[PDB]
Amino acid sequence: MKLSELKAGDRAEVTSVAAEPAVRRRLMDLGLVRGAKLKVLRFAPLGDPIEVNCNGMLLTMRRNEAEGITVHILAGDEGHPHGWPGFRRRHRFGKRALEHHHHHH
């Protein structure tokens, strides 16, 4: 689910951010990381950008950036609360497999 798929006043926790390496870094340096809780304050009077209150900090980013961001709703309501199978079992070949060599080669 996208961060852009939220509502004005919605409450979500960031699970993953798919964006520019520098942008994701910038956001995470602010505090928008996995586990960051944010409230969607408002979208601009036209559609973009979006103002979100993340961990107390008002972070302003572009709607297309919010599309890259996957969030989890901080509201366990009903009305079909289960979607795709990736919360109890999540397996896909990916990630930097060699988790050690970042400065080498």
Per the CB < 8 A criterion, the answer to whether 39 and 99 are in contact is no
Report d(CA 90, CA 21) in Å as an integer.
23
| Residue 90 domain-assigned (yes or no) | no
Type of residue at 76: G
| Residue 78 domain-assigned (yes or no) | yes
- Say which CATH number the domain at 58 has: 2.30.30.90
Per the CB < 8 A criterion, the answer to whether 4 and 12 are in contact is no
Tokens 């930097």, residue?
Answer: 96
Question: Phi then psi for 93, rounded to 5 degrees?
Answer: -65, 115
For the chain, what is the domain count? Answer: 1
| Residue 101 domain-assigned (yes or no) | no
| Residue 74 domain-assigned (yes or no) | yes
Query: Running DSSP on this structure, what letter comes out for residue 63?
Result: H
Report d(CA 62, CA 60) in Å as an integer.
7
Question: Phi then psi for 41, rounded to 5 degrees?
Answer: -70, -60
Per the CB < 8 A criterion, the answer to whether 71 and 15 are in contact is yes
Report d(CA 39, CA 54) in Å as an integer.
6
DSSP labels, 6-52: S-TT-EEEEEEE-S-HHHHHHHHHHT-STT-EEEEEEE-SSS-SEEE
Structure method: NMR
Type of residue at 88: R
Burial group, residue 95, by CB count within 10 angstroms (0-12, 13-18, 19+): exposed
| Residue 34 domain-assigned (yes or no) | yes
Count of Cβ atoms closer than 10 Å to residue 43 Cβ: 18
| Residue 79 domain-assigned (yes or no) | yes
